[PDB]
Amino acid sequence: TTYADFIASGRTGSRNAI
Amino acid sequence: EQESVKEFLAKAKEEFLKKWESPSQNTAQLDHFDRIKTLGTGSFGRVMLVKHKETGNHYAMKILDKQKVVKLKQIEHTLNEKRILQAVNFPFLVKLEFSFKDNSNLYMVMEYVPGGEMFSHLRRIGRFSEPHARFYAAQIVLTFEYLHSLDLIYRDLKPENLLIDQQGYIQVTDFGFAKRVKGRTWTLCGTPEYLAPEIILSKGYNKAVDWWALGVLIYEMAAGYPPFFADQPIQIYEKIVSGKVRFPSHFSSDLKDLLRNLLQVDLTKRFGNLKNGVNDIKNHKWFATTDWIAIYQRKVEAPFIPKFKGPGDTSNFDDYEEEEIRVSINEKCGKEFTEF
Numbered sequence: 001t002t003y004a005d006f007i008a009s010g011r012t013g014s015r016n017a018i
Numbered sequence: 019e020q021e022s023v024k025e026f027l028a029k030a031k032e033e034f035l036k037k038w039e040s041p042s043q044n045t046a047q048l049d050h051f052d053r054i055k056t057l058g059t060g061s062f063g064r065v066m067l068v069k070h071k072e073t074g075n076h077y078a079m080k081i082l083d084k085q086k087v088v089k090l091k092q093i094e095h096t097l098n099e100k101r102i103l104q105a106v107n108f109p110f111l112v113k114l115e116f117s118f119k120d121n122s123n124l125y126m127v128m129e130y131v132p133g134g135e136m137f138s139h140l141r142r143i144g145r146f147s148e149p150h151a152r153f154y155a156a157q158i159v160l161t162f163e164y165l166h167s168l169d170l171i172y173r174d175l176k177p178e179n180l181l182i183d184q185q186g187y188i189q190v191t192d193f194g195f196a197k198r199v200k201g202r203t204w205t206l207c208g209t210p211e212y213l214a215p216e217i218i219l220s221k222g223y224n225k226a227v228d229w230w231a232l233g234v235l236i237y238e239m240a241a242g243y244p245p246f247f248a249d250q251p252i253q254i255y256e257k258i259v260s261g262k263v264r265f266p267s268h269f270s271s272d273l274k275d276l277l278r279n280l281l282q283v284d285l286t287k288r289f290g291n292l293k294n295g296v297n298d299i300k301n302h303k304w305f306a307t308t309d310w311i312a313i314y315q316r317k318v319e320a321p322f323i324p325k326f327k328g329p330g331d332t333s334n335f336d337d338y339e340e341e342e343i344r345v346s347i348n349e350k351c352g353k354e355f356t357e358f
C-alpha cells in the first residue's frame with residue numbers, strides 16, 4: 001500500500017532542510 | 019469586503035516597514051531568566067523553555083552559537099530571521115518578546131507555544147480528517163496572504179515547523195529561510211518533500227513556491243504521508259517534477275481538485291499565482307464552509323486542543339540531553355553580528 005511504501009522510505013521522522 | 023482587506027494589508031505593511039527599518043535590539047539579558055528544559059536542538063542552535071525571573075512568565079528562548087553560525091555560513095539568515103520576527107505582526111506568527119547577545123551567543127526570546135509541533139500530533143493520530151486539515155490550512159492561507167503582501171517568501175513550510183498553541187491554533191516560528199524579495203530569487207533551499215518543482219529545476223522562482231508547499235502540507239495532513247516520497251531526495255525530486263500525483267481513495271472530490279491546482283507543475287496554472295491571487299484559493303469549493311474572518315479572529319472552535327497541565331508544561335515536546343550554556347570570556351564574532 002501507499003502507507004507501507006511510506007514506512008519503507010525511512011523518511012517518517014522529522015525532516016531536515018537541505 | 020475586499021476594500022477592508024486592502025486597507026488592512028496597507029496598514030500592516032506600514033507597521034512592518036517601520037519596524038523593519040528600525041529594529042529593536044538588546045531588550046533583556048541572560049541572567050533575567052532561569053533555564054527549565056531544552057525543547058529543541060539542531061544545527062548551530064537550541065530552543066529552551068525559560069522562566070523570566072521578575073515576572074515568572076515562561077518563554078521559549080532560541081540560543082545561537084555565533085561561532086557555529088559563522089562556521090555554517092548562516093550569518094545573513096540569522097540576522098534576517100531576527101529582523102523579520104521583530105517586524106511582523108499576525109495572529110499565526112510567533113511573537114518575539116526579547117532579543118540580546120553576549121560574548122558567545124545570540125538570544126531570541128519568543129512566546130512559549132506549549133502544544134508542540136503539528137508533526138508529532140499528525141504522526142501520532144495518523145492523519146487528520148478534512149475539516150481538521152482545512153482548519154489548519156485556512157490559517158496558512160491567511161498567513162501567506164499576510165507574508166506575501168510584505169513581499170516575504172516563506173520557503174520552509176512543513177508540519178515540523180508549525181506549533182499548536184493552547185487554543186489549538188497554529189504558530190509559525192522559523193524564518194531562517196524567508197526572504198524579502200518582490201521579483202525572483204534563486205537559492206536552492208527548503209525540505210525535499212516540500213520543494214516546488216521550479217526550485218528543483220534551478221529556475222528563478224517566486225512566492226508561488228509557498229502555494230505549492232501548501233498543497234504538499236494539505237495532502238500530508240489529510241493522507242498522513244506526503245504526496246512525493248522515496249528512499250533518497252533525488253528520487254523524491256523526480257516524482258515532484260514528473261507532474262503525476264496519486265490521491266488516497268478517501269480524499270473528497272473538492273480536496274483533489276484543490277490539490278491538483280496547488281500541486282500544479284505549470285506556474286501559469288498554479289493557484290495563488292494567477293490573476294485573482296489568493297482568492298482562487300479562498301473561494302475554492304473545499305473552503306466553502308470556511309469563515310475566513312472568524313479564523314483570523316480566532317473565534318472558530320479548534321478541532322484539537324493539546325494537553326496542557328499549566329504554565330511550563332513540556333509534555334508535548336521531546337526529551338534532550340541538557341547541555342551547558344557557556345559564555346566565553348572573549349567576545350566572538352563581534353563585527354559579524356553588530357546589527358543583532
Ligand SMILES: O=S(=O)(c1cccc2cnccc12)N1CCCNCC1
Pocket residue numbers: 057058059065078080112128129130131132135178179180181191192
Ligand atoms: O519547537 S521549537 O523548539 C520552538 C521554536 C521557536 C519558538 C518556540 C515556542 N514555543 C515552543 C517551541 C518553540 N522549534 C520550532 C519547530 C521547528 N524546529 C525548530 C525549533
